[PDB]
mmCIF file of C-alpha atoms in Angstrom:
data_model
loop_
_atom_site.group_PDB
_atom_site.id
_atom_site.type_symbol
_atom_site.label_atom_id
_atom_site.label_comp_id
_atom_site.label_asym_id
_atom_site.label_seq_id
_atom_site.Cartn_x
_atom_site.Cartn_y
_atom_site.Cartn_z
ATOM 1 C CA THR K 1163 0.000 0.000 0.000
ATOM 2 C CA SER K 1164 2.987 2.329 0.415
ATOM 3 C CA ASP K 1165 3.601 2.253 -3.343
ATOM 4 C CA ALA K 1166 -0.052 2.968 -4.137
ATOM 5 C CA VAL K 1167 -0.259 5.819 -1.635
ATOM 6 C CA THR K 1168 2.996 7.244 -3.015
ATOM 7 C CA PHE K 1169 1.431 7.162 -6.477
ATOM 8 C CA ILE K 1170 -1.669 8.875 -5.094
ATOM 9 C CA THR K 1171 0.159 11.609 -3.200
ATOM 10 C CA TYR K 1172 2.267 12.267 -6.300
ATOM 11 C CA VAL K 1173 -0.834 12.646 -8.458
ATOM 12 C CA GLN K 1174 -2.407 14.827 -5.750
ATOM 13 C CA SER K 1175 0.642 17.078 -5.977
ATOM 14 C CA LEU K 1176 0.150 17.054 -9.751
ATOM 15 C CA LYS K 1177 -3.471 18.128 -9.207
ATOM 16 C CA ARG K 1178 -2.334 21.574 -8.079
ATOM 17 C CA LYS K 1179 0.110 22.000 -10.962
ATOM 18 C CA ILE K 1180 -2.625 20.977 -13.428
ATOM 19 C CA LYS K 1181 -4.206 24.438 -13.476
ATOM 20 C CA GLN K 1182 -0.923 26.375 -13.456
ATOM 21 C CA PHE K 1183 0.115 24.172 -16.352
ATOM 22 C CA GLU K 1184 -3.152 24.835 -18.178
ATOM 23 C CA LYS K 1185 -2.764 28.594 -17.870
ATOM 24 C CA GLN K 1186 0.792 28.105 -19.135
ATOM 25 C CA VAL K 1187 -0.856 26.354 -22.073
ATOM 26 C CA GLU K 1188 -3.194 29.147 -23.137
ATOM 27 C CA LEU K 1189 -0.603 31.832 -22.439
ATOM 28 C CA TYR K 1190 1.624 30.030 -24.899
ATOM 29 C CA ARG K 1191 -1.143 29.771 -27.478
ATOM 30 C CA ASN K 1192 -1.244 33.532 -26.954
ATOM 31 C CA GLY K 1193 2.513 33.763 -27.444
ATOM 32 C CA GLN K 1194 2.770 31.314 -30.345
ATOM 33 C CA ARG K 1195 -0.083 32.712 -32.432
ATOM 34 C CA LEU K 1196 1.321 36.159 -31.635
ATOM 35 C CA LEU K 1197 4.739 35.062 -32.871
ATOM 36 C CA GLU K 1198 3.232 33.674 -36.076
ATOM 37 C CA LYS K 1199 1.362 36.936 -36.633
ATOM 38 C CA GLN K 1200 4.628 38.649 -35.763
ATOM 39 C CA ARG K 1201 6.053 36.400 -38.533
ATOM 40 C CA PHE K 1202 9.211 35.296 -36.763
ATOM 41 C CA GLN K 1203 11.259 32.475 -38.262
ATOM 42 C CA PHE K 1204 10.707 29.443 -36.058
ATOM 43 C CA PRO K 1205 14.078 27.714 -35.500
ATOM 44 C CA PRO K 1206 14.469 24.048 -36.478
ATOM 45 C CA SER K 1207 14.821 23.112 -32.798
ATOM 46 C CA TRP K 1208 11.460 24.736 -32.012
ATOM 47 C CA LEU K 1209 9.029 22.126 -30.717
ATOM 48 C CA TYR K 1210 5.553 22.748 -32.089
ATOM 49 C CA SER Z 37 28.164 32.423 -54.800
ATOM 50 C CA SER Z 38 24.585 31.653 -53.750
ATOM 51 C CA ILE Z 39 24.600 31.378 -49.942
ATOM 52 C CA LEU Z 40 22.355 34.434 -49.821
ATOM 53 C CA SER Z 41 20.162 32.503 -52.249
ATOM 54 C CA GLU Z 42 20.229 29.261 -50.268
ATOM 55 C CA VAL Z 43 19.607 30.945 -46.918
ATOM 56 C CA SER Z 44 16.763 32.838 -48.595
ATOM 57 C CA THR Z 45 15.482 29.486 -49.905
ATOM 58 C CA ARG Z 46 14.432 28.282 -46.431
ATOM 59 C CA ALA Z 47 11.047 30.067 -46.350
ATOM 60 C CA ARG Z 48 9.350 28.928 -43.174
ATOM 61 C CA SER Z 49 5.817 28.054 -44.335
ATOM 62 C CA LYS Z 50 2.936 29.077 -46.594
ATOM 63 C CA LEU Z 51 -0.771 29.970 -46.486
ATOM 64 C CA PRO Z 52 -3.313 28.565 -48.966
ATOM 65 C CA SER Z 53 -3.888 30.462 -52.197
ATOM 66 C CA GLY Z 54 -4.878 29.939 -55.806
ATOM 67 C CA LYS Z 55 -8.157 28.113 -55.250
ATOM 68 C CA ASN Z 56 -11.054 28.340 -57.694
ATOM 69 C CA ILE Z 57 -14.850 28.067 -57.684
ATOM 70 C CA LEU Z 58 -16.992 27.395 -60.745
ATOM 71 C CA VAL Z 59 -20.776 27.417 -61.003
ATOM 72 C CA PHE Z 60 -23.712 26.805 -63.239
ATOM 73 C CA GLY Z 61 -26.998 28.578 -62.868
ATOM 74 C CA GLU Z 62 -29.650 29.067 -65.499
ATOM 75 C CA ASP Z 63 -30.137 32.477 -67.086
ATOM 76 C CA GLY Z 64 -31.236 34.839 -64.332
ATOM 77 C CA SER Z 65 -31.416 32.215 -61.579
ATOM 78 C CA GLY Z 66 -29.977 34.667 -59.068
ATOM 79 C CA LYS Z 67 -26.565 33.006 -59.307
ATOM 80 C CA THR Z 68 -24.977 36.444 -59.597
ATOM 81 C CA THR Z 69 -27.066 37.595 -56.632
ATOM 82 C CA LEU Z 70 -25.909 34.689 -54.479
ATOM 83 C CA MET Z 71 -22.252 35.074 -55.444
ATOM 84 C CA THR Z 72 -22.307 38.834 -54.902
ATOM 85 C CA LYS Z 73 -23.958 38.394 -51.501
ATOM 86 C CA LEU Z 74 -21.195 35.971 -50.506
ATOM 87 C CA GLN Z 75 -18.588 38.747 -50.462
ATOM 88 C CA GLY Z 76 -21.167 41.328 -49.356
ATOM 89 C CA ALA Z 77 -21.902 43.373 -52.478
ATOM 90 C CA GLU Z 78 -25.643 43.764 -53.001
ATOM 91 C CA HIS Z 79 -25.376 43.018 -56.726
ATOM 92 C CA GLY Z 80 -22.613 42.759 -59.288
ATOM 93 C CA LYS Z 81 -23.289 43.011 -63.023
ATOM 94 C CA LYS Z 82 -25.745 40.735 -64.825
ATOM 95 C CA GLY Z 83 -23.869 40.315 -68.095
ATOM 96 C CA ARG Z 84 -23.284 37.757 -70.839
ATOM 97 C CA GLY Z 85 -20.541 35.165 -70.985
ATOM 98 C CA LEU Z 86 -18.222 34.105 -68.205
ATOM 99 C CA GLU Z 87 -18.119 36.528 -65.280
ATOM 100 C CA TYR Z 88 -15.700 36.864 -62.386
ATOM 101 C CA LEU Z 89 -15.894 37.723 -58.675
ATOM 102 C CA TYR Z 90 -14.002 37.289 -55.386
ATOM 103 C CA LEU Z 91 -14.096 35.468 -52.116
ATOM 104 C CA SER Z 92 -12.123 37.651 -49.728
ATOM 105 C CA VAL Z 93 -11.525 34.940 -47.126
ATOM 106 C CA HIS Z 94 -10.163 36.154 -43.792
ATOM 107 C CA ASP Z 95 -8.792 33.946 -41.013
ATOM 108 C CA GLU Z 96 -8.212 35.477 -37.589
ATOM 109 C CA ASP Z 97 -6.083 32.591 -36.290
ATOM 110 C CA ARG Z 98 -3.497 33.051 -39.038
ATOM 111 C CA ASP Z 99 -4.474 36.754 -39.197
ATOM 112 C CA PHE G 1018 -33.411 45.073 -74.856
ATOM 113 C CA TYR G 1019 -31.475 42.825 -77.180
ATOM 114 C CA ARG G 1020 -29.133 40.343 -75.485
ATOM 115 C CA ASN G 1021 -28.446 37.713 -78.103
ATOM 116 C CA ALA G 1022 -25.653 39.220 -80.234
ATOM 117 C CA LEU G 1023 -23.128 36.719 -78.888
ATOM 118 C CA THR G 1024 -25.071 33.944 -80.604
ATOM 119 C CA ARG G 1025 -25.566 36.353 -83.528
ATOM 120 C CA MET G 1026 -21.783 36.313 -83.850
ATOM 121 C CA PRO G 1027 -20.682 36.093 -87.509
ATOM 122 C CA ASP G 1028 -17.433 34.304 -86.569
ATOM 123 C CA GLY G 1029 -18.658 32.351 -83.549
ATOM 124 C CA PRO G 1030 -17.360 32.781 -79.999
ATOM 125 C CA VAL G 1031 -13.758 32.822 -81.274
ATOM 126 C CA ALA G 1032 -13.562 36.618 -81.351
ATOM 127 C CA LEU G 1033 -14.996 36.610 -77.840
ATOM 128 C CA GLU G 1034 -12.714 33.808 -76.690
ATOM 129 C CA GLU G 1035 -9.482 35.314 -78.005
ATOM 130 C CA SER G 1036 -10.437 38.514 -76.188
ATOM 131 C CA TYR G 1037 -10.605 36.574 -72.936
ATOM 132 C CA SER G 1038 -7.308 34.986 -73.960
ATOM 133 C CA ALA G 1039 -5.608 38.382 -74.014
ATOM 134 C CA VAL G 1040 -6.754 38.889 -70.425
ATOM 135 C CA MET G 1041 -5.456 35.482 -69.374
ATOM 136 C CA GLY G 1042 -2.301 36.369 -71.247
ATOM 137 C CA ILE G 1043 -1.648 39.770 -69.728
ATOM 138 C CA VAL G 1044 -2.473 38.912 -66.123
ATOM 139 C CA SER G 1045 -0.248 35.837 -66.271
ATOM 140 C CA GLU G 1046 2.720 37.846 -67.500
ATOM 141 C CA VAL G 1047 1.971 40.407 -64.801
ATOM 142 C CA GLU G 1048 2.173 37.935 -61.945
ATOM 143 C CA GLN G 1049 5.276 36.423 -63.513
ATOM 144 C CA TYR G 1050 7.039 39.780 -63.424
ATOM 145 C CA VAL G 1051 5.648 40.123 -59.912
ATOM 146 C CA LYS G 1052 6.735 36.693 -58.729
ATOM 147 C CA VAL G 1053 10.516 36.947 -59.049
ATOM 148 C CA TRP G 1054 10.437 40.517 -57.755
ATOM 149 C CA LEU G 1055 8.218 39.514 -54.834
ATOM 150 C CA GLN G 1056 10.838 36.873 -54.049
ATOM 151 C CA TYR G 1057 12.915 39.611 -52.414
ATOM 152 C CA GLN G 1058 10.558 39.631 -49.412
ATOM 153 C CA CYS G 1059 12.238 36.400 -48.315
ATOM 154 C CA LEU G 1060 15.145 38.575 -47.186
ATOM 155 C CA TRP G 1061 13.237 39.665 -44.094
ATOM 156 C CA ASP G 1062 11.975 36.184 -43.233
ATOM 157 C CA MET G 1063 15.606 35.221 -42.556
ATOM 158 C CA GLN G 1064 17.261 37.002 -39.645
ATOM 159 C CA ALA G 1065 20.878 38.050 -39.213
#
């Protein structure tokens, strides 16, 4: 049960970061669509 | 030589262009009215032979 | 008012058609002279 509860407390910690991550997501849709409409050359190492 | 040419050659991407729309409608079937309402003009010109209009297509995502 | 002269054409639609041809000619040449010249815009899309 220690392994299962470790899994669960880890995912509970992830629960909090879920929303901060999501707002990171839409702020980067903001930034990325901005950058495309700023027409900046995306480097080859850019991950889409 | 080149170099300038080859570095210029690496254009990042492209947006769609060069499409085409045909139609048939019988004489005075409002085809011109429908087409002209598509781009917003109330009416174009009801003439003879092949005619020609626009679709000014705007995308906000690509701006 | 009379709209049948196109069928009343003595030579058939050829005189009409060739007229259209001139259009399709001219515009094509135009964009051709545009195209290569427009190529210069690529210079900005690459950064120093």
